[PDB]
Design a protein around this ligand. Structure first.
Ligand SMILES: *SC[C@H](NC(=O)CC[C@H](N)C(=O)O)C(=O)NCC(=O)O
Ligand SMILES: *SC[C@H](NC(=O)CC[C@H](N)C(=O)O)C(=O)NCC(=O)O
Lengths: 212, 212
């Protein structure tokens, strides 16, 4: 059975969990206590040498980097559940393009907003409000491009839900809830409808209700 | 014929060019003048809506994000030239893992060092030397993990050259030449041998000699 390492409430393990749930892959979650620095202990560094989560162990196979992991399980269980990769090479390419947009243009801004507004105060530290404002300004412009895309396509990589949409679920949920920046989605009609659609998927609702 | 947009001397188009050369894919390079802001003009924003390079046009197919593009051509010409993806799903997964390590752990530090030390002075601006030092400190620790990996494997994803190694070529060359930080590679025996190997590949030598 697949072992997934990391907290269920953290963005990066959530991305992996969402894919496994969508694909109907049974897994065991192994909590890693990030606040206390368990991820930097020698024992865990043998699993993930950069001292980050997630990492998966599946028999004698080990893999880390969340977006590598979701690609692997989407392919390994390609014929089970939803088509998360696309079929033609050109369809697959658009999924890859919007995964790459997620992983830099979007996440570099969004995860750092969540870090400053949510993570730091939770471990008793002050966030940098002026830095957060610079991120917000940049993110408006990034999300204007998302809105343009979603005016022409139901989902980011085409007319169906794929890894590209899935990969946005964890950081976006923190952005529009704990971080109080829901307007970035609500201000944009197509983006908002996309968000309310993908975040209502049964696999995601399951994952978030368990997390609290 | 494939059109690749961007300067031949820029890191991001170089990544794409290296893959096309390795796969024996003919292409036309269309220079985009980044220093003067051509990439932010309406005409180019129709090609790449985030105002960045590269973007490729291949008949009626358009694609951007450099790492999506190299995945696409590695698959489209899978049986031509080198096996850049891996064969089994588990082999493919390790290529993906080390592409993801490149794209955040490594590149977030390396491209920002190159930005500060090389790009900014070239457009008449001062780099932030103290910020560069913080990047260097972090990058030593990242490259210690690369050294550990390369002590156990000839290349990053296995015993053969793949997209994972290829994707490191452009930013690493700037790091160890123009940025004057060659010691980060030279200090590490396995990493240095890996670098001198992959950067001596005919496709890469071709690309860099043309660039000047
Ligand atoms: S969300 C939890 C953190 N993980 C990562 O940042 C992983 C990023 C990788 N690029 C990936 O898997 O996608 C984490 O472990 N935070 C704790 C820490 O000490 O960094
Ligand atoms: S290296 C040239 C710059 N491109 C990118 O930063 C592209 C990053 C993407 N994530 C990718 O394709 O990998 C560039 O265009 N610089 C000029 C600018 O105005 O940003």
């Amino acid at each position: 059975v697949v072992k997934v390492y990391g907290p269920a409430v953290a963005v990066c393990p959530q991305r992996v969990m969402a894919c496994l749930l969508e694909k109907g892959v049974e897994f065991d979650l192994v909590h890693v206590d990030l606040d206390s620095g368990e991820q930097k202990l020698p024992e865990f560094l043998l699993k993930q040498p950069f001292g980050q989560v997630p990492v998966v162990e599946d028999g004698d196979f080990k893999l880390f980097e969340s977006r590598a992991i979701i690609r692997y399980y989407a392919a390994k269980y390609e014929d089970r559940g939803p088509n998360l990769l696309g079929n033609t090479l050109e369809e697959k390419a658009l999924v890859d393009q919007w995964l790459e947009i997620e992983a830099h243009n979007f996440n570099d801004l969004v995860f750092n907003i969540v870090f400053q507004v949510v993570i730091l105060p939770r471990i008793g530290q002050q966030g940098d409000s002026e830095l957060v404002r610079t991120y917000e300004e940049k993110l408006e412009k990034v999300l204007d491009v998302y809105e343009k895309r979603l005016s022409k396509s139901k989902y980011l990589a085409g007319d169906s839900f794929t890894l590209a949409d899935l990969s946005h679920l964890p950081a976006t949920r923190y952005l529009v809830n704990e971080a109080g920046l829901g307007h970035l989605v609500k201000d944009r009609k197509k983006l908002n409808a996309w968000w309310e659609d993908i975040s209502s998927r049964p696999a995601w609702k399951k994952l978030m209700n368990l997390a609290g």
